[PDB]
Amino acid sequence: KIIINLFAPNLPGSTKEDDLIQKSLRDQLVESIRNSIAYRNVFFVDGTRGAGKTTFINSVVKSLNSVNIKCLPTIDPTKLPRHEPILVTVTARLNKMVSDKLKGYWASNDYRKQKEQWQNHLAQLQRGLHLLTDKEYKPEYFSDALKLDAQLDYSIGGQDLSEIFEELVKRACEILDCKAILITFDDIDTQFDAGWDVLESIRKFFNSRKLVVVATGDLRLYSQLIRGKQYENYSKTLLEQEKESVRLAERGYMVEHLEQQYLLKLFPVQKRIQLKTMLQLVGEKGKAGKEEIKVKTEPGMQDIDAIDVRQAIGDAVREGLNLREGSDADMYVNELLKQPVRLLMQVLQDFYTKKYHATSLSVPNLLRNALYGSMLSSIYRAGLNYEQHRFGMDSLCKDIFTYVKQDRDFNTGFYLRPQSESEALRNCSIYLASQVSENCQGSLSKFLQMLLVGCGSVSIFNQFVTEDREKFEQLISEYVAYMSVGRIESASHWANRCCAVVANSPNDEKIGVFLGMVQLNRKSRQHMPGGYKKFNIDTENGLAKAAMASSLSTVASNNLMDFCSVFNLIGAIADISACRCERSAITNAFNKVIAQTTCIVPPWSEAQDDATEFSDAITKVEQWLKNVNEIEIGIRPSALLIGKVWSRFYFNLNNVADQHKTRLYRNAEHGRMASQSNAAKIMRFNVLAFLHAVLVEESLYHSVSDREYIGEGLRLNPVTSVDEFEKKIKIIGEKLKADNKTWKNTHPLFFLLISCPILHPFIFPVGGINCSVKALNKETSFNKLIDEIVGDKLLSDEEWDYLTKNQQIFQNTITSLNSSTIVGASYDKDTPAR
Amino acid sequence: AGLNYEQHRFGMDSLCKDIFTYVKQDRDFNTGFYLRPQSESEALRNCSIYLASQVSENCQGSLSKFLQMLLVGCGSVSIFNQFVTE
């Protein structure tokens, strides 16, 4: 039953008993030390850096101070003059204890008889300081020694120091009416050059049974200290005369054997004590804890109802990372509990004080500030953005991109999972998750923009750019320049170079289908039957023109190749949610790609009034903008969810790119079956793939929801049809109706994604609808549920039957895009049907 | 040898990474998962029994944990040699 108050100063020297962590390991050692002396007598307690080692020495020394063993007060070799030997401090500190007893044992016959020995011991030990502290011994001092007496019967000749200190200690103990004395050392992590003096002195003089030693630190540090001190034991010329690789290992193995026996002899294994980390004591998610540790956020709550450590770190990190409860946050706190005492204690302390002071919300804002001050080393080592005010749209995306590059796994880098082996990756991963939970809160622009630039840039880097090891870094160096990651621009502009990276590789047979991309024909092929020709640009309606303008890409090579990509639709809608006013983003964001934004060939290559009708599209968009601006305030997404959201979108577009590659046929004139694939069908399955992917796992991982709204079953991506998606609509919809749950509070994003007027015209194409005896009826049932979700009747009665059943220009559907030829295909094959 | 040493980090992922790195030093992707302390180097021999005890340490009184390290601790070493090294 440990109650931890964070408001306390919690310094190593002032922490009381109730806030102590390790007690069962403490009293176990104290009894053993008493048992050890009751009959090389050096006890070593091992813990991670800054993990209650100082509190442990004070606790054990007080228990012995409070089997009569007198323990010397704590001494820190780093807390000493640089050139001052510790053996000087030990005698000086010990002199204080012995002289204090003589002050008590004063005014008696034995008081003179005890002091006379004491003066003898210090004098004879003083002469050994000239032996050591001298920079070079002088033969004129050979008479300083050799004046040995019959007193104390010096066994070893000359001025040997090992026996003199031992004799002083034994006489000191009997004055101190104790059978033995204890020396308490401290860590040397801060100042480490004095550790070598500590190691040599311990094995030389600290061997008497009457003297017991306890030491702290980290054994990894001692390994480096001794190994370095063993290479210097070699002659200098030998190191730079025998440079052979086999010799470098043989002599290196010599010092490893030398270092191994050094630590084992100095620190025996039995007296070694391995300290307990917090997670070993708090326990696993279900395992019983050895000791019950409880923490407090505010000093006000009772010590019996204080929230548990597992509970305290759960919700705070969850809402600080904006992720649902479950095992997803369990692995996060699994990583966190592996951090040392100081970092975890500080992060809990400052975050909770910020939470209390602010409440008297933005939980990730407090966690971001709390975690920033504790993870400085790896963040500075990770090449991150360091300025406080540069927490921006583009800097964070660039930072995560390179974080993936050091991860080197281009597939799972953007999930921001803090499960990495390397410290730099693990520390940076959790911080990146904290920041994205604050830039994406209550926002749709940052939601979509980061979802595309930070999650797919690396995937296309492997897919198109990546496909001597300096090449692994020259590909890294070139991509951050050409792609212009960290170069802030419009979201559709971010996909403009992505189009060139997509279009740099011509596919087999020059088939005009790419990764969710429309490749129009501008040339005049001779002798075309059917209804395929050049697609006009000044004969359609504004609705279709507006969507096409937001669904157009331009690349200019020796053979210019106009594009009609789908990512621009995501790009165009991204900045609209940001500006949301001034009546210019609704007009200017659409048109830079068409003519103003020209993407140059990559270096690695081998190459009624005209504008009045637009008011109708504006009016419906403005009403939707009014709706979405007041709905987007309850958004708390997660990077791991968003990373999978893009990935789910990522695999979903691959089906139409591959399967529909050979699905084009000569009789695809407003084709009715899924066997054929005209120009409209490819892009129709593009938006469906995008819209189906987001809906699948939005309920599986969410901020407001608690469970899933699909339930149990199989979830896939459309390869030929949305028949599985047609089932997903009905199951969720009935659950949304059988259980009175609203659309916006469980699926806010998808509510505003499906019902946007920008994507609406292309949802019901003239030639992309699968028409059959049963398939067309399914599409009509699909249509009714689409109109139900969006609310407003997008497509009327006549303009749905006139296209599905079997000129007329309709705003909610582009009319000539199905007849728009795709160059390089020519539709030579014929349509099979069963 | 270059293994894991923190008391908290000990687990299934740490052991397989330690075992995989232990195989790398001996360059024995065939009998590496046998964890035989029979290598020419003494220190590499010394680190072999260190992992051998650990493998039999947490496997005592567990069958669910036995399956998980059979898949990774014995399969990661096998497939990497056969389908990446080859």
Per DSSP, the residues of A191-253 read S-TTHHHHHHHHHHHTT-TTEEEEE-S-HHHHHHHHHHHHHTTS-HHHHTT---HHHHHHHHH
Q: Are A367 and A321 in contact (CB under 8 A)?
A: yes
Q: How far is B34 from chain A (nearest CA, A)?
A: 24
Asked if A253's CB is within 8 angstroms of B43's CB, the reply is yes
Q: Are A392 and A406 in contact (CB under 8 A)?
A: no
Q: Are A754 and A792 in contact (CB under 8 A)?
A: no
Q: What does the DSSP 8-state code read for residue B83? A: I
Q: Are A460 and A502 in contact (CB under 8 A)?
A: yes
Q: How far apart are CA A379 and CA A425, in angstroms?
A: 9
Dihedral of CA atoms A594, A598, A602, A603 in degrees, nearest 10, equals 170
Q: How far apart are CA A455 and CA A650, in angstroms?
A: 9
Residues shown for chain A: 834
Q: What does the DSSP 8-state code read for residue A344? A: H
Selected for mutation to probe chain B from A421, A422, A426 (highest B CB count within 10 Å) is A421
Q: How far apart are CA A395 and CA A410, in angstroms?
A: 19
Q: How far apart are CA A178 and CA A72, in angstroms?
A: 12
Between the CA of residue A204 and those of A287, A395, B68, what are the distances in Å? 46, 57, 50
Q: 3-state DSSP call for residue A700?
A: coil
Return the residue of B nearest to A275 by Cα: B7
Which backbone phi and psi does A599 adopt, to 5 degrees? -95, 125
Q: Supply A61's token pair.
A: 């020394």
Q: How far is A221 from chain B (nearest CA, A)?
A: 13
Largest Cα–Cα separation, chain A: 131
Q: What does the DSSP 8-state code read for residue A661? A: G
Q: With CA atoms as reference, report the closest residue to A670 among A806, A553, A762, A810.
A: A806
- Given phi > 0 = left and psi -120 to 50 = alpha, else beta, which region is A461? alpha
Q: How far is A47 from chain B (nearest CA, A)?
A: 9
Q: 3-state DSSP call for residue A561?
A: strand
Q: With CA atoms as reference, report the closest residue to A194 among A44, A77, A87.
A: A77
Q: How far is A279 from chain B (nearest CA, A)?
A: 7
Q: Are A779 and A771 in contact (CB under 8 A)?
A: yes
Closest CB to A421 among B17, B42, B43? B17
Q: With CA atoms as reference, report the closest residue to A501 among A549, A472, A459, A473.
A: A459
CA A17 from centre of chain: 36
Handedness of CA A420, A424, A425, A429 (dihedral sign): positive
Q: With CA atoms as reference, report the closest residue to B18 among A413, B30, A222, B6.
A: B6
Handedness of CA A167, A172, A177, A178 (dihedral sign): negative
Q: Which amino acid is at A287?
A: K
Q: Which chain A residues have a beta carbon less than 8 Å from that of B9?
A: 338
Resolution reading in Å: 4.0
Handedness of CA B10, B6, A61, A183 (dihedral sign): positive
Q: How far apart are CA A759 and CA A571, in angstroms?
A: 12
Q: With CA atoms as reference, report the closest residue to B34 among B44, B25, B23, B24.
A: B23
Return the residue of B nearest to A338 by Cα: B8
Q: Which chain B residues have a beta carbon less than 8 Å from that of A275?
A: 7
Q: Supply A221's token pair.
A: 């540090």
Q: Which amino acid is at A236?
A: K
Residues 6 or more apart in contact with residue A179 via CB below 8 angstroms: A37, A68, A69, A173, A210
Closest CB to B7 among A220, A257, A280? A280
Which backbone phi and psi does A563 adopt, to 5 degrees? -130, 160
Q: Which chain A residues have a beta carbon less than 8 Å from that of B17?
A: 421
Q: How far apart are CA A94 and CA A73, in angstroms?
A: 9
Residues 6 or more apart in contact with residue A533 via CB below 8 angstroms: A819, A821
CA A723 from centre of chain: 38
Between the CA of residue A144 and those of A126, A594, B51, what are the distances in Å? 12, 98, 57
Between the CA of residue A555 and those of A467, A500, A559, A589, A597, what are the distances in Å? 21, 7, 9, 18, 9
Return the residue of B nearest to A255 by Cα: B43
Q: How far apart are CA A142 and CA A127, in angstroms?
A: 12
Return the residue of A nearest to B17 by Cα: A421
For A172-210, b where at least 16 C-beta lie within 10 A, e where not — what string?
bbebbebebbbbbbbbbeeebebbebbbebbeebbebeb
Token look-up 């030093």 returns B25
Asked if A256's CB is within 8 angstroms of B6's CB, the reply is no
Q: β-strands A293-296, A70-71: how paired?
A: unpaired
Q: Supply A75's token pair.
A: 């001494």
Cβ burial of A806 (10 Å; 0-12, 13-18, 19+) is exposed
Q: How far apart are CA B48 and CA B27, in angstroms?
A: 13
Those residues of chain B whose CB sits closer than 8 Å to some CB in chain A are: 5-9, 13, 17, 41-43
Asked if B6's CB is within 8 angstroms of A280's CB, the reply is no
Q: How far is A305 from chain B (nearest CA, A)?
A: 28
Q: Which chain B residues have a beta carbon less than 8 Å from that of A259?
A: none
Dihedral of CA atoms A522, A525, A527, A528 in degrees, nearest 10, equals -40
Q: Which chain A residues have a beta carbon less than 8 Å from that of B8?
A: 277-280, 337-338
Q: How far apart are CA A368 and CA A437, in angstroms?
A: 9
Closest CB to A256 among B5, B9, B43? B43
Q: What does the DSSP 8-state code read for residue A553? A: E
Between the CA of residue A756 and those of A589, A652, A750, what are the distances in Å? 16, 20, 10
Q: Are A820 and A826 in contact (CB under 8 A)?
A: no
Q: What is the DSSP string of A276-336?
A: --HHHHH--SSSPPSS-EEEESSTTS-TTSPPBHHHHHHHHHHHHHT--SSHHHHHHHHHH
Asked if A253's CB is within 8 angstroms of B6's CB, the reply is no
Q: Which chain A residues have a beta carbon less than 8 Å from that of B13?
A: 419
Q: With CA atoms as reference, report the closest residue to A277 among A339, A322, A327, A366.
A: A339
Q: Are A799 and A644 in contact (CB under 8 A)?
A: no
Dihedral of CA atoms A403, A408, A412, A418 in degrees, nearest 10, equals -50
Size of the A and B interface in Cβ pairs below 8 Å: 23
Q: With CA atoms as reference, report the closest residue to A170 among A112, A124, A210.
A: A210
Q: How far is A176 from chain B (nearest CA, A)?
A: 40
Q: How far is B8 from chain A (nearest CA, A)?
A: 6
Q: How far apart are CA A159 and CA A165, in angstroms?
A: 11
Q: What does the DSSP 8-state code read for residue A92? A: H
Selected for mutation to probe chain B from A261, A275, A338, A343 (highest B CB count within 10 Å) is A338
Which backbone phi and psi does A364 adopt, to 5 degrees? -60, -25
Direct distance between the N- and C-terminal alpha carbons of chain B, in angstroms, rounded to an integer: 25
Q: How far is B18 from chain A (nearest CA, A)?
A: 11
Dihedral of CA atoms A337, A340, A343, A346 in degrees, nearest 10, equals 80
Q: Are A763 and A794 in contact (CB under 8 A)?
A: yes
Asked if A280's CB is within 8 angstroms of B43's CB, the reply is no
Return the residue of A nearest to B3 by Cα: A421
Cβ burial of A216 (10 Å; 0-12, 13-18, 19+) is buried
Q: How far apart are CA A296 and CA A447, in angstroms?
A: 35
Cβ burial of A823 (10 Å; 0-12, 13-18, 19+) is middle
Q: With CA atoms as reference, report the closest residue to A2 among A290, A222, A218, A233.
A: A290
Q: Are A370 and A351 in contact (CB under 8 A)?
A: yes
Q: Which amino acid is at A657?
A: A
Q: Are A438 and A639 in contact (CB under 8 A)?
A: no
Q: Which chain B residues have a beta carbon less than 8 Å from that of A220?
A: 5
Q: β-strands A181-184, A70-71: how paired?
A: parallel
Closest CB to B9 among A275, A278, A338? A338
Give the side-chain half-sphere CA count within 13 A for A440: 28
Q: What does the DSSP 8-state code read for residue A44? A: E
Q: With CA atoms as reference, report the closest residue to A36 among A271, A266, A208, A273.
A: A271
Asked if A253's CB is within 8 angstroms of B41's CB, the reply is yes
Q: How far apart are CA A146 and CA A473, in angstroms?
A: 70
Q: Which chain A residues have a beta carbon less than 8 Å from that of B27?
A: none
Q: Which amino acid is at A132?
A: L
Q: Which chain A residues have a beta carbon less than 8 Å from that of B41?
A: 253
Q: With CA atoms as reference, report the closest residue to A52 among A216, A213, A198, A183.
A: A216
Closest CB to A337 among B8, B41, B43? B8
Q: Are A384 and A402 in contact (CB under 8 A)?
A: no
For A295-304, b where at least 16 C-beta lie within 10 A, e where not — what string?
bbbeeeeeee
Q: Name the β-bridge partners of A70.
A: A181
Q: Which amino acid is at A205?
A: F
Return the residue of A nearest to B41 by Cα: A253
Return the residue of B nearest to A339 by Cα: B8
Asked if B7's CB is within 8 angstroms of A338's CB, the reply is no
Q: With CA atoms as reference, report the closest residue to A130 among A118, A145, A147.
A: A145
Q: Which chain B residues have a beta carbon less than 8 Å from that of A337?
A: 8
In SS3 terms, A130-189 reads as HHHHCCCCCHHHCCCCCCCCCHHHCCCCCCCHHHHHHHHHHHHHHHCCCCCEEEECCCCC
Q: 3-state DSSP call for residue A555?
A: strand
Between the CA of residue A62 and those of A44, A46, A212, A272, what are the distances in Å? 17, 19, 15, 20
Residue A667: count of CB within 10 angstroms of its CB: 16
Which backbone phi and psi does A43 adopt, to 5 degrees? -105, 130
Asked if B8's CB is within 8 angstroms of A277's CB, the reply is yes
Q: How far apart are CA A297 and CA A355, in angstroms?
A: 9
Q: Of all helices (H) and strands (E), which one includes residue A395?
A: helix A393-407
Asked if B43's CB is within 8 angstroms of A277's CB, the reply is no
Q: How far is A234 from chain B (nearest CA, A)?
A: 21
Q: Are A733 and A785 in contact (CB under 8 A)?
A: yes
Q: Are A94 and A75 in contact (CB under 8 A)?
A: no
Q: How far apart are CA A680 and CA A687, in angstroms?
A: 11
Residues shown for chain B: 86
Q: Are A181 and A210 in contact (CB under 8 A)?
A: yes
Asked if B17's CB is within 8 angstroms of A277's CB, the reply is no
Q: β-strands A561-563, A553-555: how paired?
A: antiparallel
Q: Are A705 and A736 in contact (CB under 8 A)?
A: no
Q: Which amino acid is at A474?
A: Q
Asked if A274's CB is within 8 angstroms of B8's CB, the reply is no
Those residues of chain A whose CB sits closer than 8 Å to some CB in chain B are: 48, 220, 253, 256-257, 274-280, 337-338, 419, 421
CA B24 from centre of chain: 10
Q: Which chain B residues have a beta carbon less than 8 Å from that of A338?
A: 6, 8-9
Q: Are B54 and B3 in contact (CB under 8 A)?
A: no
Asked if A220's CB is within 8 angstroms of B5's CB, the reply is yes
Asked if B9's CB is within 8 angstroms of A280's CB, the reply is no
